[PDB]
């Protein structure tokens, strides 16, 4: 088969249309302000 049977945990999180995304900004958008 190969072994690496990808699971992930399908059907676990309740997502909507634009369902979460880059919203995590990533803590990068700090570049500037004083």
């Amino acid at each position: 088969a190969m072994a690496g049977i990808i699971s992930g945990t399908p059907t676990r999180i309740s997502v909507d249309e634009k369902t979460e995304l880059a919203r995590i900004a990533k803590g990068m958008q700090d570049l500037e302000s004083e």
Partner: protein, 107 residues
Amino acid sequence: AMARMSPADKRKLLDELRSIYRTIVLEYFNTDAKVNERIDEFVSKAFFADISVSQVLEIHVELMDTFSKQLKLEGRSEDILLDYRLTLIDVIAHLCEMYRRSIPREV
């Protein structure tokens, strides 16, 4: 005081990057539009303007919410939202690639 580099110019860039990014999306499905010019414009400015993927990532979400919202009010296949993902991932991947090239390495 950056050579007259005020926080406005940066915002102006953001204002342009915002529209430019947006334009990239609209032309993503262009029949003759060289989206590359849009991606190249955004990429070039993003790099030069020391823009972090954050805004690219964050700005993307906001606009994406704009399309999803309309799809609901207009009851239109929201599937088209995949374009933004292809545009968002492609855009980031394009400028991200430029960064790697802007890195002079020995060898």
